[PDB]
Design a protein around this ligand. Sequence first.
Ligand SMILES: OC[C@H]1O[C@H](OC[C@H]2O[C@H](O)[C@H](O)[C@@H](O)[C@@H]2O)[C@H](O)[C@@H](O)[C@@H]1O
Length: 812
Amino acid sequence: EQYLGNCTAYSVKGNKVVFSCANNSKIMLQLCSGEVVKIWASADGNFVRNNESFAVIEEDLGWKGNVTVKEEPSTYEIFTEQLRIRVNKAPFQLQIFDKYQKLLFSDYAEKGFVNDNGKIRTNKVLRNDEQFFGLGEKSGNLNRRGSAYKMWNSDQPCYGVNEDPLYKSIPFFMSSYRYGIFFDNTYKTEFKFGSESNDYYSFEAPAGQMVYYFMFGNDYKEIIQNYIALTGKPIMPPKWALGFSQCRGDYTREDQAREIAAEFRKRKIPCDIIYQDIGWTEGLQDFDWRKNNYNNPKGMVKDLSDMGFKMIVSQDPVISQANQQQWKEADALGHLVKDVRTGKSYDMPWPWGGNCGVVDFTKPEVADWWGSYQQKPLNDGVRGFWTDMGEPAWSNEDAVDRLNMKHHLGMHNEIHNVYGFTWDKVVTEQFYKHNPNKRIFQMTRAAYAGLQRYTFGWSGDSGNGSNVLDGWKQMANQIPVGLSAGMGLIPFWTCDISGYCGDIKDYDAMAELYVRWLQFGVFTPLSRAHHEGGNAVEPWKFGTEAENISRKSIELKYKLFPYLYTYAREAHDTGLPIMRALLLEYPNDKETFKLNGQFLVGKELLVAPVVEQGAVTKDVYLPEGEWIDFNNCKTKYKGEQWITVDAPLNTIPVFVKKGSIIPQMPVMQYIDEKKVYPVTFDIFPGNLNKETSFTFYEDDGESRDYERDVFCKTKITSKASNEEIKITVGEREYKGYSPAGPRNFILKIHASNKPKDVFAGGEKLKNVKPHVLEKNIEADFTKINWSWNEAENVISVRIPDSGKNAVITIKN
Ligand SMILES: OC[C@H]1O[C@H](OC[C@H]2O[C@H](O)[C@H](O)[C@@H](O)[C@@H]2O)[C@H](O)[C@@H](O)[C@@H]1O
């Protein structure tokens, strides 16, 4: 094996420095910014790659001028605002320190880069206290330290708690030394976080180029912000995507879709999306509504739309040989992935429809061809897709025949991990071209780093196939799977609520597991119930008790829409997921590294779902601050402690941090059932003299205008003093969008005693009964008054949403 060995020279060209080492080997450092360093180690010195990065869309992160290299007798030095880079000459060793001279990231001995006949590996020093997170949508515990992980998009139905690889390959991880690494290589990469030794960790590839980005941060937020500078801001879904979604393996016909739509509304179980699974299409993949299953597809879509339902249909990336017309067409055009052994279209087995041709989404001409096909259901009013089986399916590591696939942009060993990525990119690009200035809804199974630009994600075929009732640990592991997905830039994520796998032979017996799964699931942004085949899993299938609990769970998510939607926008701006591992907000608290049974939803809410069978309590870790039971709003706990709370089947443990302001809307059956509505702000005042706030974000919810920063914002602020609370409704920030109106705001201040008075500016407000304050809340926008609820310990102040600054002073 080949190492870099001694560095004999360097050359600078703009923001790039190239170090020449032994036997034509070279290594480049490129300062994308003061915090982000692109590193390219090369065994032969050439700096070429078969394909430029599929993930990176910007290398200019604001570095000004040349890189300055200071040569010393045995080292070179490069300084930035945040980094001190030390390069050993003999042998070459890259060492990155922070500005306090603490070592962050160092080559291990002389083996920082190792080439072994095309196999490329990077070895770094590993410290005893160094922990690791990320690598995208992967199983096991959040903390990756001690384990090894592989990138090969795989199709492993009913997967276990530690199964790896899974469906998506996002080679971005973060260290608790507060740097991220993105390994910009699409081959079957492997990450070994002290699984071989305590002295080093490694990342490697069997072929391709050793290109990776070192991303400094003072916290994890800063690292993630740097990663989206490189790989793109997440697109936001249409606003209605944050409601509840329903699917089934057999959701493939008109009469059923109409019946299901009617059942949700009759039962007052809120729901926005009805999915249709792959049987909807006549053949793979013609996008024609199956004749025996749909009589009037346009009328169906329109009638569901009038009921507030949006439809999302499946697509696979293959053309069945039995679909002779479309197969012959694709094959004649050269649009199918070839077999290197024959020069002809690769003959791919598939689980339905027979052998198929794999569509080559890396061939440029395929994009418009596919776009015209997929547009058909969209012309009927369908609002988007779920892109399934893009691994490609049935192409796990052991299916070595697949390595003979030759795609336009490369061989399968390179392209496998971006097969689904490039497909999903075509789907979104073509949607944009055919449906201008509209947000796509795409939710995908298979993906690569950078997917956030084109698609959302679900975690595929989860749960227990042998016995559905024994899926508790698998359900529980969807928490860190989702949180890790979030850290890999899948902010808009869900899992199959109820799991995918396992026949439901006994609905009474499955009720408890279904309820707990849905309680967790409604805190995923794209909450979707789904199950294999004809295993119905609508929230009324498990008896009245489970139905009532499930309706309440869904209702809570809908009430939280304005809160969740604000965090949807924060995902676009910062890269932060809605579902946040506590470590992202409390990086100084090492206890957070172990938390696989709870998470934050935005910053203000801590959710701790019960994920153990028979459990009627929950152990919850509370980080810094004081924390209030969000279910009753009375019980308060001190932070930095483990507690045990009561958590029977009808309860989801949810906590709100003291200081929080939570925007909520009324219960509706779908997002924008009421196009205008009063907004309530639940205010839990912080400690004496501490100013807290929430910035309520609004936009049109449908167009791409938000990408050009067309929106409005209303900042609500709270500051408690000695026997006085000041609530400020900030002047509306208008950036080209104005909200639904006219409407009222209701400030709901949680407090132990009725106050003496409430003022709006200098004017004293009339105290009124709750019924008066509530009367004509959607009809009269000239009333300013306040009420007191002794039972709930809430001061309610009604105020028209004028868009003007107002200071509300509560006198205790
Ligand atoms: O009609 C074919 C097939 O349709 C459903 O399954 C599609 C299935 O594909 C992957 O496993 C995804 O990960 C799942 O979310 C999809 O539901 C039915 O479940 C099946 O019974 C049927 O044969």
